[PDB]
Amino acid sequence: GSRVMVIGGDGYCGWATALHLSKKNYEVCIVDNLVRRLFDHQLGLESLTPIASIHDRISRWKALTGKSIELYVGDICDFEFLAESFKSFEPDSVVHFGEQRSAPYSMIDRSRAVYTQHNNVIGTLNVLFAIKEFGEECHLVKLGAMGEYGTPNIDIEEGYITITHNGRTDTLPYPKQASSFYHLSKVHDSHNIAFTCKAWGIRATDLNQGVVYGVKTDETEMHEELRNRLDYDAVFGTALNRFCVQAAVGHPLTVYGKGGQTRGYLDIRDTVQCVEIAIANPAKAGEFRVFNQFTEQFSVNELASLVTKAGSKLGLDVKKMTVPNPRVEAEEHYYNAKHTKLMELGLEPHYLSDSLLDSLLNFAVQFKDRVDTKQIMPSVSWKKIGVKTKSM
Amino acid sequence: GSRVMVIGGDGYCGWATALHLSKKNYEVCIVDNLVRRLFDHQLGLESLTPIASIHDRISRWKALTGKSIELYVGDICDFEFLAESFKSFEPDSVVHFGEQRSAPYSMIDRSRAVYTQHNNVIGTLNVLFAIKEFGEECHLVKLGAMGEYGTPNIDIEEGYITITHNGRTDTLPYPKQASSFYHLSKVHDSHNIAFTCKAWGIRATDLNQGVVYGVKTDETEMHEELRNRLDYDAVFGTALNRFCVQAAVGHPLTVYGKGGQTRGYLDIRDTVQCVEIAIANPAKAGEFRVFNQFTEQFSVNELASLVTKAGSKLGLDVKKMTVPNPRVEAEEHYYNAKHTKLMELGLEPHYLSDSLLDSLLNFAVQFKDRVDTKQIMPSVSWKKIGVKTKSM
Numbered sequence: 001g002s003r004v005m006v007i008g009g010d011g012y013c014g015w016a017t018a019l020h021l022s023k024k025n026y027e028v029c030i031v032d033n034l035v036r037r038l039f040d041h042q043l044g045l046e047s048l049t050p051i052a053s054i055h056d057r058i059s060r061w062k063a064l065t066g067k068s069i070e071l072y073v074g075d076i077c078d079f080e081f082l083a084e085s086f087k088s089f090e091p092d093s094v095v096h097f098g099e100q101r102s103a104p105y106s107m108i109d110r111s112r113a114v115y116t117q118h119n120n121v122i123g124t125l126n127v128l129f130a131i132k133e134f135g136e137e138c139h140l141v142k143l144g145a146m147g148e149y150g151t152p153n154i155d156i157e158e159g160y161i162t163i164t165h166n167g168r169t170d171t172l173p174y175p176k177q178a179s180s181f182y183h184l185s186k187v188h189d190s191h192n193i194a195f196t197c198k199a200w201g202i203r204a205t206d207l208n209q210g211v212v213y214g215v216k217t218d219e220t221e222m223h224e225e226l227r228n229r230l231d232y233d234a235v236f237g238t239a240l241n242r243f244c245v246q247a248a249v250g251h252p253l254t255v256y257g258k259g260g261q262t263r264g265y266l267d268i269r270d271t272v273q274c275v276e277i278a279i280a281n282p283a284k285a286g287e288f289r290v291f292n293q294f295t296e297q298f299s300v301n302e303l304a305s306l307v308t309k310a311g312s313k314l315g316l317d318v319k320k321m322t323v324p325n326p327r328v329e330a331e332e333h334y335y336n337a338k339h340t341k342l343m344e345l346g347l348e349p350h351y352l353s354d355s356l357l358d359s360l361l362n363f364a365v366q367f368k369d370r371v372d373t374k375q376i377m378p379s380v381s382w383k384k385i386g387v388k389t390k391s392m
Numbered sequence: 393g394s395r396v397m398v399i400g401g402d403g404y405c406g407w408a409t410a411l412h413l414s415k416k417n418y419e420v421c422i423v424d425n426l427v428r429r430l431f432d433h434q435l436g437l438e439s440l441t442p443i444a445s446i447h448d449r450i451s452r453w454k455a456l457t458g459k460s461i462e463l464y465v466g467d468i469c470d471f472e473f474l475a476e477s478f479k480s481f482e483p484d485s486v487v488h489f490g491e492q493r494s495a496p497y498s499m500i501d502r503s504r505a506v507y508t509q510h511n512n513v514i515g516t517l518n519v520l521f522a523i524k525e526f527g528e529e530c531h532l533v534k535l536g537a538m539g540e541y542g543t544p545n546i547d548i549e550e551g552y553i554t555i556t557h558n559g560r561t562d563t564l565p566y567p568k569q570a571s572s573f574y575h576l577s578k579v580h581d582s583h584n585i586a587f588t589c590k591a592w593g594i595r596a597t598d599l600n601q602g603v604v605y606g607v608k609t610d611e612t613e614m615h616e617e618l619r620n621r622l623d624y625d626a627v628f629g630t631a632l633n634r635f636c637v638q639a640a641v642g643h644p645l646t647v648y649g650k651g652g653q654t655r656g657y658l659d660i661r662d663t664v665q666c667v668e669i670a671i672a673n674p675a676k677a678g679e680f681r682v683f684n685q686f687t688e689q690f691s692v693n694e695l696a697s698l699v700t701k702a703g704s705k706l707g708l709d710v711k712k713m714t715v716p717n718p719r720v721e722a723e724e725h726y727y728n729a730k731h732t733k734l735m736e737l738g739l740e741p742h743y744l745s746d747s748l749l750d751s752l753l754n755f756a757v758q759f760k761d762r763v764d765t766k767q768i769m770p771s772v773s774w775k776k777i778g779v780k781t782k783s784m
């Protein structure tokens with residue numbers, strides 16, 4: 001074999017997924033403009049671990065396994081490029097990871113908020129049109145976000161909710177409440193895709209994924225040049241990964257506000273597994289499937305405690321600090337998000353364990369010398385966002 | 393006064409509104425790039441009635457009343473232009489009509505679907521940033537769309553719905569189900585605005601307006617050069633206006649599919665009244681108000697009957713025809729949309745009457761010679777939409 005086009009395949013989730021699918025014997029190609037690497041240069045950021053170029057990454061995989069991952073370098077917002085890539089590769093499935101995924105980045109200034117929504121929304125529209133025009137039966141596996149749902153006072157369902165209102169019943173799309181221009185762009189994406197499923201017969205699966213943690217997967221650990229990126233800065237870094245790196249360098253864990261913010265989380269190893277499951281068990285024509293993709297819920301404070309305890313076993317004497325929250329969000333809220341669709345399809349989760357934290361912490365300690373502590377504290381305010389293009 | 397910036401002020405709803413607000417003694421300016429006029433030239437379309445240039449329109453209003461409506465010609469997607477216009481005028485309220493509003497246009501091809509979403513979503517984001525940066529207390533009166541709600545099997549509320557799910561209760565944004573790339577762009581707009589109200593304290597009112605009908609308003613009838621446009625083509629024309637023009641030229645009424653499609657409608661005279669009411673009674677800081685802006689619900693078949701009966705009194709011998717529906721939508725569905733917020737604020741509606749239909753029909757007959765019958769039948773398919781840029 002089945003042919004899979006991995007848009008955003010040079011990224012954190014995409015690279016791990018591309019290698020996994022190739023190992024599982026799918027014919028794979030990567031479509032990426034590598035703009036994520038440009039963001040690092042422009043903002044002065046750097047991955048914890050050094051990563052190889054996309055060309056060397058692909059070359060190494062071929063040298064080790066003999067398998068060739070095709071590469072198409074370009075911006076999917078450029079339809080000519082996307083169309084040519086689609087016609088050249090002829091994918092049976094498309095996994096779309098190719099979007100600006102940072103909430104902080106989307107809040108830097110007007111230019112970055114506009115770039116985020118244009119890049120994400122238009123890019124996704126182009127993907128839908130390419131599928132419709134060049135391979136209508138192609139299954140779209142889209143990376144959405146648990147953040148689309150926000151933090152309502154009721155249980156969060158997997159994309160749909162059956163409601164009885166004024167004596168009548170119906171199953172409707174779950175109300176969306178995004179808290180950043182980035183999260184909003186995903187809401188827009190999901191609404192756009194749902195429409196094309198009904199109007200054109202497109203088959204798609206929206207993976208509303210929670211926060212991913214970890215850096216190792218069976219494939220990326222086979223050689224140093226296959227190593228994945230591990231972000232710890234306040235722009236692209238996420239909660240758990242950030243805390244582990246902070247613990248390793250002796251920086252107090254950065255708890256934003258009260259720390260009651262609760263979200264779904266999952267090991268990067270489960271990210272690749274879930275995507276493969278979605279590909280192996282495709283949506284039917286005209287069906288818009290929605291899976292809540294995470295394995296466990298944790299509050300920020302809970303993560304802080306787990307990392308502190310794990311760090312103690314390594315003599316890190318982890319400390320915690322309360323950082324005035326740069327974001328506008330509920331710091332204490334109800335949270336009970338449903339997640340059984342993937343489990344029903346055979347998901348065998350890697351729940352957060354002492355072993356994972358021990359491994360991740362030791363990894364951070366190993367490359368502690370490469371950590372730029374100046375990028376640990378957040379400097380992007382949700383409320384103070386302006387129109388002048390900022391230079392970090 | 394109070395200063396009002398009318399974005400899209402050269403358009404159908406915008407022009408009538410700009411004149412009305414000026415008459416009501418608000419200081420008014422119009423921000424428009426006049427791209428709507430370019431669409432007419434590009435697609436070979438033309439208004440039923442000849443309209444004057446925006447410059448002559450504004451000049452005539454000044455000659456008649458002595459009042460000056462300031463004009464800023466530019467694309468709001470160009471932030472430099474929008475910022476300069478905002479700083480120059482210093483609006484207390486902004487009414488945003490400046491978007492690509494045709495569902496058929498948004499379905500012509502990939503380029504037009506992408507243009508629709510980019511123009512609308514990015515333009516609206518720029519407006520939000522301009523308000524935040526140059527006049528945070530400025531009230532945004534946004535034109536949304538009843539189409540955002542789709543046609544669910546339950547009552548449609550005014551933006552929000554209180555639901556009890558699994559033993560818990562909460563009031564959430566009403567589920568959105570748009571049926572075109574244009575309607576989808578409005579859903580995106582509304583979600584984006586709601587976020588900025590909470591994050592930045594923006595005050596906004598989303599006017600989810602139904603289908604507008606009519607061509608006359610007290611102000612536009614004061615002189616021929618103030619005349620508003622009346623669209624009847626299958627791209628920009630809407631149901632009732634289209635039927636009246638069809639009846640006048642002896643063309644069978646174009647009922648798409650079964651004709652059970654039900655929507656909310658309102659006289660253009662109520663459009664201007666509702667906008668003024670929203671401006672005179674502004675939303676509070678951080679509040680995202682949502683009003684369902686229409687006065688009565690009608691099914692396509694119901695409109696066909698009303699126009700036939702009205703046409704009979706003028707000896708038009710109106711006929712009806714069933715056109716294979718170019719759109720993907722429910723042709724028989726439940727529809728009970730709530731609309732009381734505007735009435736509670738003092739709306740004095742002009743319900744559809746024999747007098748209105750008689751007047752509108754006679755108007756169409758008056759300019760029947762200018763009707764290009766080749767543009768009456770729809771040629772844009774929701775399902776056959778392609779990637780090649782079309783030339784109509």
Ligand SMILES: NC(=O)c1ccc[n+]([C@@H]2O[C@H](COP(=O)([O-])OP(=O)(O)OC[C@H]3O[C@@H](n4cnc5c(N)ncnc54)[C@H](O)[C@@H]3O)[C@@H](O)[C@H]2O)c1
Nearest residue numbers: 008011012013032033034035036075076098099101209212
């Ligand atoms: N990282 C997480 O914790 C997490 C959690 C939930 C969902 N996801 C989702 O998974 C997807 C990938 O996330 P990630 O962490 O791997 O991101 P990333 O930034 O590491 O990877 C995204 C990749 O997409 C590429 N890209 C972006 N825009 C592109 C365009 N216009 N054309 C071609 N390529 C483009 C970038 O260059 C990059 O290589 C995103 O949708 C994201 O929101 C990630």
Ligand SMILES: NC(=O)c1ccc[n+]([C@@H]2O[C@H](COP(=O)([O-])OP(=O)(O)OC[C@H]3O[C@@H](n4cnc5c(N)ncnc54)[C@H](O)[C@@H]3O)[C@@H](O)[C@H]2O)c1
Nearest residue numbers: 400403404405424425426427428467468490491493601604
């Ligand atoms: N006409 C209806 O029946 C109806 C019904 C419900 C809601 N509305 C809404 O009211 C608004 C106006 O509708 P209309 O019928 O007057 O449309 P229209 O096309 O006659 O007017 C829109 C105006 O906006 C201007 N414009 C578009 N993009 C612009 C940009 N990037 N920068 C500056 N100016 C721009 C166009 O040139 C045009 O003059 C739309 O949001 C529409 O969806 C209209």
Ligand SMILES: O=c1ccn([C@@H]2O[C@H](COP(=O)(O)OP(=O)(O)O[C@H]3O[C@H](CS(=O)(=O)O)[C@@H](O)[C@H](O)[C@H]3O)[C@@H](O)[C@H]2O)c(=O)[nH]1
Nearest residue numbers: 101102103145146147210211238239242254255256261300
């Ligand atoms: O040092 C930190 C980092 C984060 N947080 C808090 O932890 C929560 C999660 O934040 P995060 O930065 O780890 O993740 P988020 O911004 O939500 O974004 C990431 O996780 C999202 C999953 S979700 O929100 O959709 O569930 C994906 O969509 C995004 O692409 C990905 O970047 C937030 O309340 C945040 O304020 C802290 O308290 N301290």
Ligand SMILES: O=c1ccn([C@@H]2O[C@H](COP(=O)(O)OP(=O)(O)O[C@H]3O[C@H](CS(=O)(=O)O)[C@@H](O)[C@H](O)[C@H]3O)[C@@H](O)[C@H]2O)c(=O)[nH]1
Nearest residue numbers: 493494495537538539602603630631634646647648653692
């Ligand atoms: O000759 C015609 C024209 C229309 N219809 C049907 O009548 C209904 C209304 O169509 P329309 O073209 O009059 O209006 P619509 O496309 O919904 O769009 C217009 O009305 C919308 C109000 S609403 O959908 O948001 O309620 C606004 O948002 C849009 O900007 C404006 O162009 C549809 O089911 C359509 O298929 C016919 O049967 N015959």
